């Protein structure tokens, strides 16, 4: 018996499993409201980190 | 001159073998970096000797 070289299994696929979505955006909620202001008094809402 | 004997049994422990270790330098050196093997093969037969 004479050792010649080494072997290693080559990876075929790839798993990019990521954690499920975090801070959801209030976009779903801004389109579902019972009251809305006029045209000249439009509200400016700040949305960040979503 | 002794008049009576005393049969005794002693013990003696001597190692004759050790742990047959085998370290693969393909995983020890350049664990998972694929670019590491390009520089590892530059040295030579350090993984063979």
UniProtKB/Swiss-Prot annotation, chain B:
It comes from the Viruses. Changing residue 48 to A: In strain: Isolate SZ3. Glycans are attached at residue 4. Mediates fusion of the virion and cellular membranes by acting as a class I viral fusion protein. Under the current model, the protein has at least three conformational states: pre-fusion native state, pre-hairpin intermediate state, and post-fusion hairpin state. During viral and target cell membrane fusion, the coiled coil regions (heptad repeats) assume a trimer-of-hairpins structure, positioning the fusion peptide in close proximity to the C-terminal region of the ectodomain. This is Spike protein S2. It comes from Severe acute respiratory syndrome coronavirus (SARS-CoV). The lineage of its organism: Viruses, Riboviria, Orthornavirae, Pisuviricota, Pisoniviricetes. The gene is S. The chain holds residues 696 to 744 of 1255 of the full protein.
């Amino acid at each position: 018996i004479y050792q010649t070289s080494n072997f290693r299994v080559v990876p075929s696929g790839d798993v990019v499993r990521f954690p499920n979505i975090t801070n959801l955006c209030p976009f779903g909620e801004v389109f579902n409201a019972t009251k809305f202001p006029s045209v000249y008094a439009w509200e400016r809402k700040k949305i960040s980190n979503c | 001159i002794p008049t009576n004997f005393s049969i005794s049994i002693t013990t003696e422990v001597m190692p004759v073998s050790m742990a047959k270790t085998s370290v693969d330098c393909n995983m020890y050196i350049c664990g998972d970096s694929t670019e590491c093997a390009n520089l590892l093969l530059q040295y030579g037969s350090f993984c063979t000797q």
